[PDB]
Design a binder for this molecule. Structure first.
Ligand SMILES: Cn1cc(-c2ccc(-c3cncc(Cl)c3N3CCC4(CCNC4=O)CC3)cc2)cn1
Lengths: 266, 343
Protein backbone atom coordinates (compact mmCIF):
# COMPACT_ATOMS: atom_id res chain seq x y z
CA UNK A 1 0.00 0.00 0.00
CA UNK A 2 1.38 3.40 -1.10
CA UNK A 3 3.15 5.62 1.51
CA UNK A 4 2.44 3.03 4.26
CA UNK A 5 5.44 3.93 6.49
CA UNK A 6 5.53 7.69 5.75
CA UNK A 7 3.13 9.02 8.45
CA UNK A 8 5.57 11.25 10.37
CA UNK A 9 6.42 13.28 7.24
CA UNK A 10 2.92 12.98 5.70
CA UNK A 11 0.52 15.84 4.90
CA UNK A 12 -1.99 14.07 7.21
CA UNK A 13 0.29 14.38 10.28
CA UNK A 14 1.80 17.77 9.37
CA UNK A 15 -1.42 19.62 8.37
CA UNK A 16 -4.54 17.62 9.36
CA UNK A 17 -3.84 16.83 13.04
CA UNK A 18 -5.62 19.89 14.44
CA UNK A 19 -5.72 21.53 17.88
CA UNK A 20 -8.93 20.96 19.90
CA UNK A 21 -9.27 24.69 20.74
CA UNK A 22 -8.75 25.80 17.09
CA UNK A 23 -11.44 23.28 16.04
CA UNK A 24 -13.94 24.44 18.69
CA UNK A 25 -13.24 28.12 17.84
CA UNK A 26 -14.23 27.66 14.17
CA UNK A 27 -17.29 25.65 15.35
CA UNK A 28 -18.79 28.64 17.28
CA UNK A 29 -20.29 30.07 14.05
CA UNK A 30 -22.46 26.90 13.66
CA UNK A 31 -23.17 26.85 17.43
CA UNK A 32 -25.25 30.05 17.03
CA UNK A 33 -27.88 27.90 15.26
CA UNK A 34 -27.27 24.51 17.00
CA UNK A 35 -26.33 23.25 20.47
CA UNK A 36 -23.13 21.27 21.20
CA UNK A 37 -25.21 18.09 21.57
CA UNK A 38 -27.08 18.76 18.29
CA UNK A 39 -23.81 19.32 16.34
CA UNK A 40 -22.46 15.93 17.52
CA UNK A 41 -25.80 14.22 16.69
CA UNK A 42 -25.46 15.79 13.23
CA UNK A 43 -21.89 14.38 12.95
CA UNK A 44 -23.13 10.87 13.85
CA UNK A 45 -25.91 11.16 11.25
CA UNK A 46 -23.69 12.05 8.27
CA UNK A 47 -21.12 9.43 9.32
CA UNK A 48 -23.91 6.84 8.98
CA UNK A 49 -24.94 8.32 5.58
CA UNK A 50 -21.41 7.94 4.15
CA UNK A 51 -21.29 4.36 5.55
CA UNK A 52 -24.63 3.53 3.87
CA UNK A 53 -23.41 5.04 0.57
CA UNK A 54 -20.21 2.98 0.76
CA UNK A 55 -21.96 -0.32 1.58
CA UNK A 56 -24.44 0.18 -1.29
CA UNK A 57 -21.52 0.83 -3.69
CA UNK A 58 -19.66 -2.24 -2.29
CA UNK A 59 -16.59 -0.14 -1.41
CA UNK A 60 -13.88 -1.33 0.99
CA UNK A 61 -13.90 0.01 4.59
CA UNK A 62 -10.66 1.97 3.94
CA UNK A 63 -12.41 3.92 1.12
CA UNK A 64 -15.39 4.74 3.37
CA UNK A 65 -13.06 6.00 6.14
CA UNK A 66 -11.13 8.26 3.72
CA UNK A 67 -14.40 9.81 2.49
CA UNK A 68 -15.57 10.26 6.11
CA UNK A 69 -12.30 12.05 6.92
CA UNK A 70 -12.68 14.29 3.81
CA UNK A 71 -16.15 15.22 5.12
CA UNK A 72 -14.96 16.01 8.67
CA UNK A 73 -11.95 17.99 7.39
CA UNK A 74 -14.21 20.16 5.20
CA UNK A 75 -16.71 21.16 7.92
CA UNK A 76 -13.93 21.52 10.51
CA UNK A 77 -12.87 24.60 8.49
CA UNK A 78 -16.19 25.83 7.03
CA UNK A 79 -19.82 26.20 8.12
CA UNK A 80 -22.62 23.72 7.37
CA UNK A 81 -24.32 26.51 5.36
CA UNK A 82 -21.37 26.81 2.92
CA UNK A 83 -22.10 23.63 0.92
CA UNK A 84 -25.09 21.32 1.53
CA UNK A 85 -23.86 18.20 3.43
CA UNK A 86 -26.36 16.11 1.39
CA UNK A 87 -24.23 17.12 -1.64
CA UNK A 88 -20.82 16.75 0.07
CA UNK A 89 -21.31 13.21 1.46
CA UNK A 90 -21.53 11.52 -1.99
CA UNK A 91 -18.86 13.92 -3.39
CA UNK A 92 -16.46 12.68 -0.67
CA UNK A 93 -17.16 9.03 -1.58
CA UNK A 94 -16.73 9.85 -5.30
CA UNK A 95 -13.32 11.51 -4.76
CA UNK A 96 -12.15 8.84 -2.24
CA UNK A 97 -13.00 5.98 -4.64
CA UNK A 98 -10.92 7.71 -7.37
CA UNK A 99 -7.84 7.84 -5.06
CA UNK A 100 -7.59 4.00 -4.95
CA UNK A 101 -6.29 2.16 -8.07
CA UNK A 102 -8.60 -0.89 -7.72
CA UNK A 103 -12.25 -0.48 -8.78
CA UNK A 104 -14.22 2.31 -10.48
CA UNK A 105 -17.40 4.25 -9.57
CA UNK A 106 -19.38 5.54 -12.56
CA UNK A 107 -21.40 8.77 -12.64
CA UNK A 108 -24.81 7.09 -13.04
CA UNK A 109 -24.01 4.52 -10.31
CA UNK A 110 -23.13 7.27 -7.79
CA UNK A 111 -26.33 9.27 -8.42
CA UNK A 112 -28.49 6.10 -8.29
CA UNK A 113 -26.78 5.01 -5.05
CA UNK A 114 -27.28 8.39 -3.32
CA UNK A 115 -30.97 8.48 -4.35
CA UNK A 116 -31.65 4.90 -3.24
CA UNK A 117 -29.86 5.17 0.13
CA UNK A 118 -31.67 8.35 1.28
CA UNK A 119 -35.01 6.96 0.05
CA UNK A 120 -34.70 3.49 1.61
CA UNK A 121 -32.56 3.98 4.76
CA UNK A 122 -32.95 7.71 5.67
CA UNK A 123 -36.62 8.56 4.90
CA UNK A 124 -37.12 9.74 8.52
CA UNK A 125 -34.64 12.59 7.78
CA UNK A 126 -35.54 13.32 4.13
CA UNK A 127 -39.13 13.38 2.76
CA UNK A 128 -38.12 14.73 -0.68
CA UNK A 129 -35.87 12.77 -3.05
CA UNK A 130 -32.15 13.48 -3.64
CA UNK A 131 -32.22 16.65 -5.86
CA UNK A 132 -28.61 16.73 -7.18
CA UNK A 133 -27.58 15.60 -10.67
CA UNK A 134 -23.94 14.76 -11.57
CA UNK A 135 -22.89 18.33 -12.53
CA UNK A 136 -23.47 19.30 -8.87
CA UNK A 137 -21.02 16.56 -7.75
CA UNK A 138 -18.32 17.59 -10.26
CA UNK A 139 -18.51 21.29 -9.31
CA UNK A 140 -18.47 20.34 -5.60
CA UNK A 141 -15.47 18.01 -6.14
CA UNK A 142 -13.33 21.05 -7.12
CA UNK A 143 -14.21 22.90 -3.89
CA UNK A 144 -13.38 19.80 -1.76
CA UNK A 145 -9.96 19.24 -3.37
CA UNK A 146 -9.08 22.94 -2.90
CA UNK A 147 -9.93 23.26 0.83
CA UNK A 148 -8.07 20.03 1.64
CA UNK A 149 -4.98 21.48 -0.16
CA UNK A 150 -4.88 18.28 -2.27
CA UNK A 151 -4.26 16.11 0.84
CA UNK A 152 -5.81 12.88 -0.45
CA UNK A 153 -3.74 10.17 1.30
CA UNK A 154 -5.41 9.34 4.64
CA UNK A 155 -4.00 6.98 7.30
CA UNK A 156 -6.53 4.99 9.38
CA UNK A 157 -6.44 2.90 12.61
CA UNK A 158 -7.17 -0.45 10.86
CA UNK A 159 -3.63 -1.23 9.58
CA UNK A 160 -2.04 -0.48 12.98
CA UNK A 161 -4.84 -2.48 14.73
CA UNK A 162 -4.18 -5.61 12.62
CA UNK A 163 -0.48 -5.41 13.52
CA UNK A 164 -1.17 -5.14 17.28
CA UNK A 165 -3.65 -8.08 17.48
CA UNK A 166 -1.28 -10.19 15.35
CA UNK A 167 1.44 -9.25 17.88
CA UNK A 168 -0.81 -10.25 20.84
CA UNK A 169 -1.55 -13.57 19.12
CA UNK A 170 -5.34 -13.28 19.62
CA UNK A 171 -6.86 -12.24 16.29
CA UNK A 172 -9.89 -14.55 16.66
CA UNK A 173 -10.88 -13.28 20.12
CA UNK A 174 -10.13 -9.52 19.76
CA UNK A 175 -10.08 -8.34 16.10
CA UNK A 176 -13.86 -8.39 15.37
CA UNK A 177 -14.73 -6.23 18.42
CA UNK A 178 -11.72 -3.85 18.14
CA UNK A 179 -12.37 -3.31 14.42
CA UNK A 180 -16.01 -2.26 15.08
CA UNK A 181 -14.88 0.11 17.86
CA UNK A 182 -12.53 1.70 15.27
CA UNK A 183 -15.59 2.15 12.99
CA UNK A 184 -17.42 3.83 15.92
CA UNK A 185 -14.58 6.36 16.51
CA UNK A 186 -15.52 7.98 13.17
CA UNK A 187 -18.66 9.24 14.97
CA UNK A 188 -16.27 11.55 16.91
CA UNK A 189 -13.51 14.11 16.13
CA UNK A 190 -10.71 11.68 17.15
CA UNK A 191 -9.37 11.23 13.59
CA UNK A 192 -8.64 15.01 13.42
CA UNK A 193 -6.97 15.13 16.90
CA UNK A 194 -4.80 12.00 17.38
CA UNK A 195 -2.52 9.84 15.14
CA UNK A 196 -4.18 6.62 13.80
CA UNK A 197 -2.07 4.15 15.85
CA UNK A 198 -3.11 5.87 19.12
CA UNK A 199 -6.82 5.34 18.32
CA UNK A 200 -6.06 1.69 17.43
CA UNK A 201 -4.54 1.07 20.90
CA UNK A 202 -7.52 2.76 22.60
CA UNK A 203 -10.03 0.58 20.69
CA UNK A 204 -8.03 -2.57 21.50
CA UNK A 205 -7.88 -1.61 25.20
CA UNK A 206 -11.68 -1.12 25.30
CA UNK A 207 -12.09 -4.46 23.46
CA UNK A 208 -9.89 -6.13 26.13
CA UNK A 209 -11.93 -4.54 28.94
CA UNK A 210 -15.25 -5.54 27.28
CA UNK A 211 -14.13 -9.18 26.79
CA UNK A 212 -12.37 -9.42 30.22
CA UNK A 213 -8.98 -10.16 28.60
CA UNK A 214 -6.08 -9.32 30.94
CA UNK A 215 -3.48 -7.47 28.82
CA UNK A 216 -1.85 -5.07 31.32
CA UNK A 217 1.72 -6.34 30.77
CA UNK A 218 1.43 -6.13 26.95
CA UNK A 219 0.17 -2.51 27.13
CA UNK A 220 2.96 -1.64 29.63
CA UNK A 221 5.61 -3.09 27.26
CA UNK A 222 4.73 -0.44 24.61
CA UNK A 223 6.61 2.90 24.62
CA UNK A 224 3.77 5.41 24.03
CA UNK A 225 2.22 8.38 25.88
CA UNK A 226 -0.38 6.44 27.90
CA UNK A 227 -2.11 9.63 29.17
CA UNK A 228 -3.12 10.47 25.57
CA UNK A 229 -4.56 6.94 25.13
CA UNK A 230 -6.69 7.37 28.29
CA UNK A 231 -8.07 10.61 26.76
CA UNK A 232 -9.18 8.59 23.69
CA UNK A 233 -10.77 5.83 25.82
CA UNK A 234 -12.87 8.42 27.71
CA UNK A 235 -14.13 9.80 24.35
CA UNK A 236 -14.98 6.25 23.21
CA UNK A 237 -16.77 5.55 26.52
CA UNK A 238 -18.60 8.90 26.26
CA UNK A 239 -19.62 8.00 22.68
CA UNK A 240 -21.51 4.89 23.88
CA UNK A 241 -23.40 6.90 26.53
CA UNK A 242 -24.39 9.38 23.76
CA UNK A 243 -25.41 6.38 21.57
CA UNK A 244 -27.71 5.16 24.40
CA UNK A 245 -29.46 8.55 24.86
CA UNK A 246 -29.70 9.41 21.12
CA UNK A 247 -32.62 8.18 19.01
CA UNK A 248 -31.28 9.23 15.58
CA UNK A 249 -34.53 8.34 13.81
CA UNK A 250 -36.85 10.41 16.08
CA UNK A 251 -34.61 13.50 16.54
CA UNK A 252 -32.81 14.07 13.21
CA UNK A 253 -35.65 15.70 11.19
CA UNK A 254 -35.89 18.59 13.68
CA UNK A 255 -32.08 18.97 13.95
CA UNK A 256 -31.67 19.21 10.14
CA UNK A 257 -34.23 22.07 10.05
CA UNK A 258 -32.21 23.91 12.76
CA UNK A 259 -29.11 23.82 10.45
CA UNK A 260 -28.10 27.16 8.90
CA UNK A 261 -28.95 27.01 5.19
CA UNK A 262 -27.02 28.42 2.19
CA UNK A 263 -28.21 31.91 1.22
CA UNK A 264 -29.14 32.37 -2.47
CA UNK A 265 -27.66 35.14 -4.67
CA UNK A 266 -29.29 38.62 -4.60
CA UNK B 1 -28.34 28.29 -6.81
CA UNK B 2 -27.36 25.38 -4.50
CA UNK B 3 -24.42 26.91 -2.61
CA UNK B 4 -23.86 29.82 -0.19
CA UNK B 5 -23.25 33.06 -2.12
CA UNK B 6 -20.89 34.75 0.40
CA UNK B 7 -18.75 31.60 0.61
CA UNK B 8 -18.74 31.34 -3.21
CA UNK B 9 -17.67 34.94 -3.96
CA UNK B 10 -15.15 35.03 -1.07
CA UNK B 11 -13.30 32.03 -2.57
CA UNK B 12 -13.53 33.47 -6.09
CA UNK B 13 -11.83 36.68 -4.88
CA UNK B 14 -9.09 34.77 -2.98
CA UNK B 15 -8.43 32.03 -5.58
CA UNK B 16 -4.99 32.20 -7.20
CA UNK B 17 -5.26 31.96 -11.00
CA UNK B 18 -2.38 30.59 -13.10
CA UNK B 19 -2.70 33.36 -15.75
CA UNK B 20 -2.27 36.14 -13.13
CA UNK B 21 0.66 34.56 -11.21
CA UNK B 22 2.74 33.13 -14.10
CA UNK B 23 4.02 34.25 -17.52
CA UNK B 24 3.92 31.35 -20.01
CA UNK B 25 2.32 32.37 -23.37
CA UNK B 26 4.43 31.06 -26.27
CA UNK B 27 6.66 29.20 -23.77
CA UNK B 28 5.24 25.72 -24.52
CA UNK B 29 8.10 23.16 -24.28
CA UNK B 30 6.14 19.88 -24.53
CA UNK B 31 2.83 18.41 -25.73
CA UNK B 32 1.77 14.77 -25.28
CA UNK B 33 -0.91 12.53 -23.75
CA UNK B 34 -0.13 14.00 -20.30
CA UNK B 35 -1.23 17.42 -21.64
CA UNK B 36 0.61 20.70 -22.34
CA UNK B 37 3.78 21.67 -20.40
CA UNK B 38 5.29 25.22 -20.38
CA UNK B 39 8.52 26.85 -19.19
CA UNK B 40 7.03 29.47 -16.84
CA UNK B 41 8.24 32.45 -14.77
CA UNK B 42 6.51 34.44 -12.00
CA UNK B 43 4.89 37.75 -13.08
CA UNK B 44 5.43 39.21 -9.59
CA UNK B 45 9.17 38.46 -9.65
CA UNK B 46 10.15 37.10 -6.23
CA UNK B 47 11.85 33.79 -7.16
CA UNK B 48 13.00 34.77 -10.68
CA UNK B 49 13.66 31.13 -11.75
CA UNK B 50 12.09 28.74 -14.27
CA UNK B 51 9.12 26.48 -13.43
CA UNK B 52 7.52 23.59 -15.35
CA UNK B 53 3.80 24.42 -15.67
CA UNK B 54 1.57 21.51 -16.78
CA UNK B 55 -2.10 21.69 -17.81
CA UNK B 56 -3.49 18.15 -17.59
CA UNK B 57 -5.20 16.69 -20.69
CA UNK B 58 -9.01 16.61 -20.59
CA UNK B 59 -11.53 18.08 -18.17
CA UNK B 60 -12.13 17.48 -14.46
CA UNK B 61 -10.29 15.07 -12.17
CA UNK B 62 -9.60 11.71 -13.82
CA UNK B 63 -8.35 8.72 -11.79
CA UNK B 64 -4.89 9.21 -13.39
CA UNK B 65 -4.91 12.91 -12.40
CA UNK B 66 -6.31 12.14 -8.91
CA UNK B 67 -3.57 9.62 -8.03
CA UNK B 68 -0.78 11.77 -9.55
CA UNK B 69 -1.80 14.68 -7.30
CA UNK B 70 -2.32 12.31 -4.33
CA UNK B 71 1.18 10.74 -4.44
CA UNK B 72 3.24 13.82 -5.53
CA UNK B 73 1.72 15.77 -2.65
CA UNK B 74 3.27 13.26 -0.17
CA UNK B 75 6.54 12.35 -1.94
CA UNK B 76 9.65 14.43 -1.09
CA UNK B 77 13.18 13.38 -2.15
CA UNK B 78 15.96 15.31 -4.00
CA UNK B 79 16.00 12.77 -6.88
CA UNK B 80 12.21 12.87 -7.49
CA UNK B 81 10.40 15.80 -9.13
CA UNK B 82 8.50 17.97 -6.60
CA UNK B 83 4.92 19.15 -7.11
CA UNK B 84 5.14 22.80 -5.93
CA UNK B 85 1.52 23.95 -6.43
CA UNK B 86 -1.87 22.93 -7.92
CA UNK B 87 -4.20 25.47 -9.63
CA UNK B 88 -7.81 24.42 -10.19
CA UNK B 89 -9.46 26.51 -12.92
CA UNK B 90 -13.17 26.37 -12.02
CA UNK B 91 -14.82 27.69 -15.23
CA UNK B 92 -13.21 25.35 -17.81
CA UNK B 93 -12.61 22.63 -15.14
CA UNK B 94 -8.89 22.34 -16.06
CA UNK B 95 -6.18 21.31 -13.59
CA UNK B 96 -2.73 22.90 -13.58
CA UNK B 97 0.36 21.48 -11.84
CA UNK B 98 3.54 23.46 -11.02
CA UNK B 99 6.98 21.77 -10.86
CA UNK B 100 10.65 22.74 -10.66
CA UNK B 101 11.97 23.24 -14.21
CA UNK B 102 14.58 20.77 -15.53
CA UNK B 103 16.53 22.00 -18.59
CA UNK B 104 17.75 18.52 -19.67
CA UNK B 105 17.02 14.79 -19.82
CA UNK B 106 18.86 11.53 -20.59
CA UNK B 107 17.05 11.15 -23.94
CA UNK B 108 18.51 14.43 -25.26
CA UNK B 109 21.89 14.01 -23.50
CA UNK B 110 22.44 10.53 -24.99
CA UNK B 111 21.16 11.69 -28.42
CA UNK B 112 23.67 14.61 -28.33
CA UNK B 113 26.60 12.20 -27.76
CA UNK B 114 25.33 9.82 -30.46
CA UNK B 115 24.95 12.87 -32.75
CA UNK B 116 28.41 14.17 -31.75
CA UNK B 117 30.22 10.85 -32.41
CA UNK B 118 29.31 11.08 -36.13
CA UNK B 119 28.93 14.82 -36.88
CA UNK B 120 30.27 11.34 -20.76
CA UNK B 121 33.31 13.69 -20.59
CA UNK B 122 33.33 14.00 -16.79
CA UNK B 123 34.61 10.48 -16.01
CA UNK B 124 32.00 9.65 -13.31
CA UNK B 125 28.93 11.20 -15.00
CA UNK B 126 27.47 7.75 -15.85
CA UNK B 127 28.08 6.53 -12.28
CA UNK B 128 26.61 9.72 -10.81
CA UNK B 129 23.62 9.48 -13.15
CA UNK B 130 23.17 5.82 -12.16
CA UNK B 131 23.49 6.42 -8.39
CA UNK B 132 20.93 9.23 -8.30
CA UNK B 133 18.48 7.19 -10.41
CA UNK B 134 18.85 4.27 -7.94
CA UNK B 135 18.52 6.59 -4.92
CA UNK B 136 15.27 8.00 -6.35
CA UNK B 137 13.69 4.62 -7.19
CA UNK B 138 14.74 3.26 -3.78
CA UNK B 139 12.74 6.10 -2.19
CA UNK B 140 9.68 5.24 -4.31
CA UNK B 141 10.00 1.47 -3.72
CA UNK B 142 10.49 1.98 0.04
CA UNK B 143 7.09 3.75 0.00
CA UNK B 144 5.54 0.93 -2.14
CA UNK B 145 5.38 3.21 -5.22
CA UNK B 146 6.35 1.73 -8.61
CA UNK B 147 7.41 3.85 -11.59
CA UNK B 148 6.12 1.33 -14.21
CA UNK B 149 7.62 3.18 -17.24
CA UNK B 150 11.29 4.03 -16.65
CA UNK B 151 13.16 5.30 -19.72
CA UNK B 152 15.69 8.10 -20.63
CA UNK B 153 12.86 10.56 -21.46
CA UNK B 154 11.60 10.27 -17.84
CA UNK B 155 15.09 10.75 -16.27
CA UNK B 156 15.46 14.55 -16.05
CA UNK B 157 18.63 16.46 -15.13
CA UNK B 158 18.63 20.00 -13.72
CA UNK B 159 20.39 22.80 -15.63
CA UNK B 160 22.12 25.87 -14.20
CA UNK B 161 20.87 26.98 -10.76
CA UNK B 162 21.05 25.75 -7.12
CA UNK B 163 20.33 22.09 -8.05
CA UNK B 164 22.96 22.05 -10.87
CA UNK B 165 23.20 18.58 -12.50
CA UNK B 166 20.86 16.76 -10.11
CA UNK B 167 18.81 13.86 -11.50
CA UNK B 168 15.02 14.23 -11.15
CA UNK B 169 12.82 11.19 -11.87
CA UNK B 170 9.55 12.11 -13.62
CA UNK B 171 6.30 10.63 -14.95
CA UNK B 172 5.56 7.63 -12.73
CA UNK B 173 2.76 5.31 -13.86
CA UNK B 174 0.31 6.76 -11.36
CA UNK B 175 -2.85 4.91 -12.48
CA UNK B 176 -2.86 1.44 -14.03
CA UNK B 177 -6.14 -0.48 -13.57
CA UNK B 178 -5.84 -3.08 -10.75
CA UNK B 179 -2.01 -2.62 -10.92
CA UNK B 180 -1.80 -4.38 -14.31
CA UNK B 181 -0.49 -3.90 -17.89
CA UNK B 182 -3.44 -6.06 -19.13
CA UNK B 183 8.56 1.39 -27.55
CA UNK B 184 9.26 -1.90 -25.75
CA UNK B 185 13.03 -1.32 -25.34
CA UNK B 186 12.99 -0.96 -21.53
CA UNK B 187 10.29 -3.56 -20.72
CA UNK B 188 11.37 -6.63 -18.71
CA UNK B 189 11.01 -10.14 -20.23
CA UNK B 190 8.24 -11.19 -17.77
CA UNK B 191 6.02 -8.34 -19.10
CA UNK B 192 6.81 -9.49 -22.65
CA UNK B 193 5.82 -13.04 -21.52
CA UNK B 194 2.51 -11.78 -20.03
CA UNK B 195 3.06 -10.97 -16.34
CA UNK B 196 -0.24 -9.84 -14.75
CA UNK B 197 1.29 -7.36 -12.24
CA UNK B 198 3.98 -4.66 -12.19
CA UNK B 199 6.80 -5.25 -9.67
CA UNK B 200 9.85 -3.55 -8.16
CA UNK B 201 11.96 -5.92 -10.32
CA UNK B 202 10.37 -4.47 -13.51
CA UNK B 203 11.70 -0.98 -12.69
CA UNK B 204 15.19 -2.45 -12.05
CA UNK B 205 15.46 -4.06 -15.50
CA UNK B 206 14.70 -0.63 -17.04
CA UNK B 207 17.53 0.95 -14.98
CA UNK B 208 19.87 -1.74 -16.34
CA UNK B 209 18.84 -0.81 -19.89
CA UNK B 210 19.47 2.90 -19.15
CA UNK B 211 22.87 2.07 -17.60
CA UNK B 212 23.78 0.03 -20.71
CA UNK B 213 22.66 2.92 -22.93
CA UNK B 214 24.72 5.40 -20.83
CA UNK B 215 27.86 3.25 -21.31
CA UNK B 216 27.47 2.64 -25.08
CA UNK B 217 25.30 5.60 -26.23
CA UNK B 218 22.88 3.12 -27.94
CA UNK B 219 19.72 1.37 -26.70
CA UNK B 220 20.83 -2.15 -25.70
CA UNK B 221 17.56 -3.80 -26.81
CA UNK B 222 16.93 -1.50 -29.81
CA UNK B 223 14.09 -2.67 -32.06
CA UNK B 224 11.64 -1.73 -34.85
CA UNK B 225 8.30 0.04 -34.19
CA UNK B 226 -0.77 -7.06 -26.82
CA UNK B 227 1.71 -8.27 -24.13
CA UNK B 228 3.73 -10.61 -26.40
CA UNK B 229 6.29 -9.17 -28.85
CA UNK B 230 8.49 -11.55 -30.90
CA UNK B 231 11.11 -9.14 -32.33
CA UNK B 232 11.70 -7.49 -28.92
CA UNK B 233 12.28 -10.93 -27.37
CA UNK B 234 14.45 -11.85 -30.39
CA UNK B 235 16.63 -8.80 -29.61
CA UNK B 236 16.84 -9.59 -25.87
CA UNK B 237 18.09 -13.13 -26.72
CA UNK B 238 20.49 -11.70 -29.37
CA UNK B 239 22.14 -9.73 -26.55
CA UNK B 240 21.64 -11.92 -23.46
CA UNK B 241 21.38 -15.40 -24.96
CA UNK B 242 18.45 -17.75 -24.31
CA UNK B 243 17.71 -18.47 -20.61
CA UNK B 244 18.50 -22.00 -19.36
CA UNK B 245 16.02 -23.81 -17.10
CA UNK B 246 18.38 -23.27 -14.13
CA UNK B 247 18.60 -19.51 -14.94
CA UNK B 248 14.81 -18.94 -14.74
CA UNK B 249 12.87 -21.83 -13.13
CA UNK B 250 9.48 -20.05 -12.93
CA UNK B 251 9.46 -19.19 -16.70
CA UNK B 252 7.13 -22.22 -17.23
CA UNK B 253 4.51 -20.46 -15.04
CA UNK B 254 4.32 -17.49 -17.48
CA UNK B 255 1.14 -17.40 -19.64
CA UNK B 256 3.08 -16.96 -22.93
CA UNK B 257 5.67 -19.73 -22.26
CA UNK B 258 4.15 -22.10 -24.88
CA UNK B 259 4.21 -19.34 -27.53
CA UNK B 260 7.89 -18.76 -26.66
CA UNK B 261 8.69 -22.47 -27.15
CA UNK B 262 6.75 -22.52 -30.46
CA UNK B 263 8.58 -19.50 -31.91
CA UNK B 264 12.14 -19.84 -30.47
CA UNK B 265 15.05 -22.31 -30.23
CA UNK B 266 17.99 -22.20 -27.76
CA UNK B 267 20.44 -23.17 -30.52
CA UNK B 268 19.74 -19.91 -32.43
CA UNK B 269 21.40 -17.89 -29.60
CA UNK B 270 24.34 -20.23 -28.91
CA UNK B 271 27.08 -17.59 -29.46
CA UNK B 272 25.24 -14.82 -27.54
CA UNK B 273 26.04 -13.25 -24.16
CA UNK B 274 26.08 -9.90 -22.32
CA UNK B 275 29.88 -10.33 -22.02
CA UNK B 276 30.39 -10.61 -25.80
CA UNK B 277 27.94 -7.74 -26.50
CA UNK B 278 29.57 -5.24 -24.10
CA UNK B 279 33.03 -6.30 -25.38
CA UNK B 280 31.92 -5.17 -28.87
CA UNK B 281 31.11 -1.69 -27.43
CA UNK B 282 34.50 -1.30 -25.64
CA UNK B 283 33.32 -2.16 -22.08
CA UNK B 284 35.42 -4.69 -20.14
CA UNK B 285 33.77 -7.71 -18.42
CA UNK B 286 36.39 -7.46 -15.62
CA UNK B 287 35.10 -3.97 -14.70
CA UNK B 288 32.88 -3.35 -11.65
CA UNK B 289 30.47 -1.50 -14.01
CA UNK B 290 29.84 -4.69 -15.99
CA UNK B 291 29.30 -6.94 -12.94
CA UNK B 292 26.72 -4.48 -11.55
CA UNK B 293 25.01 -4.25 -14.98
CA UNK B 294 24.78 -8.07 -15.18
CA UNK B 295 23.08 -8.11 -11.75
CA UNK B 296 20.60 -5.46 -12.98
CA UNK B 297 19.98 -7.20 -16.34
CA UNK B 298 19.10 -10.66 -15.00
CA UNK B 299 16.44 -12.60 -16.97
CA UNK B 300 14.66 -14.08 -13.93
CA UNK B 301 12.88 -11.31 -11.90
CA UNK B 302 13.41 -12.99 -8.49
CA UNK B 303 17.19 -13.22 -9.26
CA UNK B 304 17.35 -9.49 -10.15
CA UNK B 305 19.14 -7.19 -7.66
CA UNK B 306 17.21 -4.58 -5.60
CA UNK B 307 17.92 -0.83 -5.80
CA UNK B 308 19.09 -0.86 -2.15
CA UNK B 309 21.63 -3.63 -2.90
CA UNK B 310 22.65 -1.85 -6.15
CA UNK B 311 23.56 1.31 -4.20
CA UNK B 312 25.72 -0.84 -1.88
CA UNK B 313 27.71 -2.20 -4.88
CA UNK B 314 31.52 -1.65 -4.70
CA UNK B 315 31.34 0.03 -8.16
CA UNK B 316 30.24 3.18 -6.24
CA UNK B 317 33.30 2.92 -3.92
CA UNK B 318 35.68 2.74 -6.91
CA UNK B 319 37.45 5.91 -8.14
CA UNK B 320 35.84 8.13 -9.47
CA UNK B 321 33.13 8.56 -6.80
CA UNK B 322 29.55 9.67 -7.56
CA UNK B 323 28.93 13.44 -7.24
CA UNK B 324 25.67 15.32 -6.55
CA UNK B 325 26.26 17.48 -9.64
CA UNK B 326 26.60 14.90 -12.46
CA UNK B 327 28.47 17.52 -14.54
CA UNK B 328 31.10 17.79 -11.72
CA UNK B 329 31.36 21.60 -12.02
CA UNK B 330 32.07 21.45 -15.80
CA UNK B 331 30.39 23.65 -18.43
CA UNK B 332 27.15 22.14 -19.80
CA UNK B 333 27.41 21.68 -23.61
CA UNK B 334 23.80 20.50 -24.12
CA UNK B 335 21.36 23.05 -25.56
CA UNK B 336 18.32 24.47 -23.75
CA UNK B 337 14.77 23.33 -24.59
CA UNK B 338 13.25 24.76 -27.78
CA UNK B 339 9.75 26.26 -27.64
CA UNK B 340 6.86 24.62 -29.53
CA UNK B 341 4.99 27.51 -31.20
CA UNK B 342 2.78 25.39 -33.52
CA UNK B 343 -0.50 24.49 -31.71
C1 LIG C 1 9.61 17.64 -26.94
N1 LIG C 1 10.05 17.31 -25.59
C2 LIG C 1 9.68 17.94 -24.45
C3 LIG C 1 10.32 17.34 -23.40
C4 LIG C 1 10.20 17.71 -21.96
C5 LIG C 1 9.85 19.02 -21.58
C6 LIG C 1 9.75 19.36 -20.24
C7 LIG C 1 10.00 18.40 -19.26
C8 LIG C 1 9.91 18.71 -17.81
C9 LIG C 1 10.82 19.63 -17.28
N2 LIG C 1 10.80 19.94 -15.99
C10 LIG C 1 9.93 19.39 -15.15
C11 LIG C 1 9.00 18.46 -15.58
CL1 LIG C 1 7.90 17.79 -14.41
C12 LIG C 1 8.97 18.09 -16.93
N3 LIG C 1 8.01 17.16 -17.34
C13 LIG C 1 8.22 15.73 -17.05
C14 LIG C 1 6.88 15.01 -16.89
C15 LIG C 1 5.89 15.34 -18.02
C16 LIG C 1 6.28 14.67 -19.36
C17 LIG C 1 5.57 13.31 -19.22
N4 LIG C 1 4.40 13.58 -18.37
C18 LIG C 1 4.56 14.72 -17.69
O1 LIG C 1 3.74 15.19 -16.91
C19 LIG C 1 5.75 16.85 -18.20
C20 LIG C 1 7.12 17.47 -18.47
C21 LIG C 1 10.36 17.10 -19.64
C22 LIG C 1 10.46 16.76 -20.97
C23 LIG C 1 11.11 16.31 -23.94
N5 LIG C 1 10.95 16.30 -25.24
Amino acid sequence: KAMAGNFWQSSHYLQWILDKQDLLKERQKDLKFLSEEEYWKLQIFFTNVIQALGEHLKLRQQVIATATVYFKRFYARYSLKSIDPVLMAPTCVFLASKVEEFGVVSNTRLIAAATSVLKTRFSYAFPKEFPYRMNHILECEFYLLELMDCCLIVYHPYRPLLQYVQDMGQEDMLLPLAWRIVNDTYRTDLCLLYPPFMIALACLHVACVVQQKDARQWFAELSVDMEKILEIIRVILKLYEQWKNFDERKEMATILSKMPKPKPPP
Amino acid sequence: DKMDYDFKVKLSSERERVEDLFEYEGCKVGRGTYGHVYKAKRKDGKDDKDYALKQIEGTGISMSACREIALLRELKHPNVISLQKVFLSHADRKVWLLFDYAEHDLWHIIKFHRASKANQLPRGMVKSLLYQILDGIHYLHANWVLHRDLKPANILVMGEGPERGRVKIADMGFARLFNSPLTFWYRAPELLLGARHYTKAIDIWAIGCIFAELLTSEPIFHCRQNPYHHDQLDRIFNVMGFPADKDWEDIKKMPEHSTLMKDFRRNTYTNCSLIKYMEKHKVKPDSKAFHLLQKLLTMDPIKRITSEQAMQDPYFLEDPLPTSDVFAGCQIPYPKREFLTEE
